[PDB]
């Protein structure tokens, strides 16, 4: 027992059943941590042992946060979230702060714990079941389910929202300039204060929360370099778009003109008046690729012109909050990665390029997962919604390591794609 509060009833989207997703393998390291976090969550009565009678399942794993060194249980509740989307989105959806994108610094607080103090609708509980695997299958799996709101379930923030609003009334009225947004297990706090004053107001929020039950993780601040902790804050201004750019060759062989045509062509679907006739004429007959076709003055007129159309964000792009968000990533090589976020095709809402953490270790997998987290974070900040990822990798390869680099409380939806480097619609030199 945790709260005299009456539980708000939740019902799966009609005609859909609960999750019956199988538990994947786990490294000793994670199991051990998972076992420990579960044993104690059991004592305090937040979860409950259960057996085969419960036909549902969701997988679990844990991540040792570089953030605070402390392990974090993670239940991949994407199925369940999908199966209960009317509840947390349409009915009790939490509003988004346009202004959050506009702060100079924005910190993220992991406030999952807040959830363990609210009973979960008694009927709905069977759906949050999970199993713990055992090295070399020494024993059968150990199963459990929640009684309190689970972390990572989109329902929790929705339900706990009244309590959260209350908890924040004080702090928010004595700081009408700070912005707070709750997205699942996190609190996005943004200010325009000097960084040092920001870093302070955060500790102050951390305090107010404590003086109310809510504990939030102790983030490390090492004294030896790299002072990674300096990244904790997000700065929604160094957040710029990456438009497409037409090259600039000295002399343009056939090859170049061709490529410049495919791309300029591709782009024609995004941007309005990209014209290519004039410039293709230069490639009017069965010519050899290496032939230095001299640029026409009639053509040049437009090459150096279309590019003027390519300097301004796709015009007429609206963000419908009622729709989904898709994101594509292209492995540009050299630790480079570019990405577009849209709802409809070719009507991108954002384009950018995640550079590369120096701790990339020449590991594409590690970098992609990091890119996916980065873009997800940007999405939440900017529109307050997670995109579905068309991931440039082989499903079975990504599934073998992504957790090893995951460091977030949420998990975005993703699918795999194998599209070659058709045209570098999205790249440079």
């Amino acid at each position, epitope marked *: 027992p945790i709260s005299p509060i009456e539980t708000v009833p939740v019902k799966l989207k009609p005609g859909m059943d609960g999750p019956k997703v199988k538990q994947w393998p786990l490294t000793e390291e994670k199991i051990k941590a998972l076992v420990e976090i579960c044993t104690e969550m059991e004592k305090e009565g937040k979860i409950s042992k259960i057996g085969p009678e419960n036909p549902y399942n969701t997988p679990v794993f844990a991540i040792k946060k570089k953030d605070s060194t402390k392990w974090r249980k993670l239940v991949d509740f994407r199925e369940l979230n999908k199966r209960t989307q009317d509840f947390w989105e349409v009915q009790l959806g939490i509003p988004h702060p346009a202004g959050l994108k506009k702060k100079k610094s924005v910190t993220v607080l992991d406030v999952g714990d807040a959830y363990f103090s609210v009973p979960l609708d008694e009927d709905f509980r069977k759906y949050t079941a999970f199993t713990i695997p055992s090295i070399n299958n020494e024993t059968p799996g150990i199963r459990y389910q929640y009684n309190v709101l689970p972390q990572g379930w989109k329902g929790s923030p929705a339900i706990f929202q009244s309590s959260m609003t209350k908890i924040l009334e004080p702090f928010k009225k004595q700081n009408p300039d700070i912005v707070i947004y709750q997205y699942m297990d996190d609190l996005y706090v943004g200010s325009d204060l000097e960084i040092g004053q920001h870093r302070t107001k955060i500790e102050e929020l951390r305090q107010h929360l404590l003086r109310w039950g809510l504990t939030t993780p102790d983030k490390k601040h090492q004294k*030896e370099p790299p002072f990674l902790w*300096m990244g904790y804050e997000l700065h929604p201004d160094k957040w710029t778009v990456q438009p497409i750019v037409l090259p600039e060759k000295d002399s343009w062989t056939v090859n170049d003109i061709q490529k410049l045509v495919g791309k300029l062509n591709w782009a024609s679907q995004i941007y309005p008046g990209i014209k290519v006739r004039q410039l293709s004429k230069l490639l009017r007959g069965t010519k050899a690729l290496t032939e230095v076709i001299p640029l026409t003055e009639e053509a040049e007129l437009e090459l150096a012109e279309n590019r003027e159309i390519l300097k301004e964000p796709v015009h007429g792009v609206y963000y419908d909050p009622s729709k989904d968000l898709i994101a594509e990533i292209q492995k540009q090589g050299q630790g480079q990665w570019t990405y577009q976020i849209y709802q409809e095709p070719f009507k991108n809402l954002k384009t950018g390029k995640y550079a590369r953490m120096r701790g990339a270790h020449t590991n594409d997998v590690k970098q992609l997962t990091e890119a996916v987290q980065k873009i997800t974070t940007e999405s939440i900040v900017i529109w307050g919604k997670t995109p579905k990822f068309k991931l440039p990798i082989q499903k079975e390869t990504w599934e073998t390591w992504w957790t090893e680099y995951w460091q977030a409380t949420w998990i975005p939806e993703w699918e795999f794609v194998n599209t070659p480097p058709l045209v570098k619609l999205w790249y440079q030199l």
Partner: antibody
Amino acid sequence: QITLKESGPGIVQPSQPFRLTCTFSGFSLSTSGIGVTWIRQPSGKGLEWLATIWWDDDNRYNPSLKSRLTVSKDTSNNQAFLNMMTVETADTAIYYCAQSAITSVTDSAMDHWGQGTSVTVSS
Amino acid sequence: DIQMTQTTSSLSASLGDRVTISCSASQDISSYLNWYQQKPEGTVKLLIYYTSSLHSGVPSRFSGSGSGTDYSLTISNLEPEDIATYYCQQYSKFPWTFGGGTKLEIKR
């Protein structure tokens, strides 16, 4: 507008302790990343790191001396202190305090120094 | 405990001259080395932070150069103040350590 000033006893009986005080203005030992460092420079010799007290009391001591050293602060008064137990003649040197500050993922230097205090160990 | 070494300790030069002082580490300190200037009086200032970044207010004729185990401070062209003792401090790992210092003098 940042300044630091060391103060102490200048002359100390051997085996006895001494307490140096760094009084600073222009910054706070509360602002994340900041910290005060104590440096030492024996008569004629070069610079020696003694200890660094951080804004989050996650202090660091020079191994050779952690045993007789204790760093501390009074944030409300912008003072930092360095206690040194059982001093010996070899402790006779100039002691500086310097505002030290972690600014980026890479930058961490002792930005401003004090003029020092001369501690002399002699019976 | 990363011992820092500046081999040349006493060095005579002349106004106008371009000088370079050596600071080598006991182990790759990944450009986490700083340069300190200590006038003959004794007041100590910061010249360069992070292998080669120019501390504010420092004359635009100072340059930090270096990497891995070896690093060099380079005084463009000597002025009379510059003739001082120079120090390199490493901050890759505590305990923080300083070179032995290189006293820059005047050729006569």
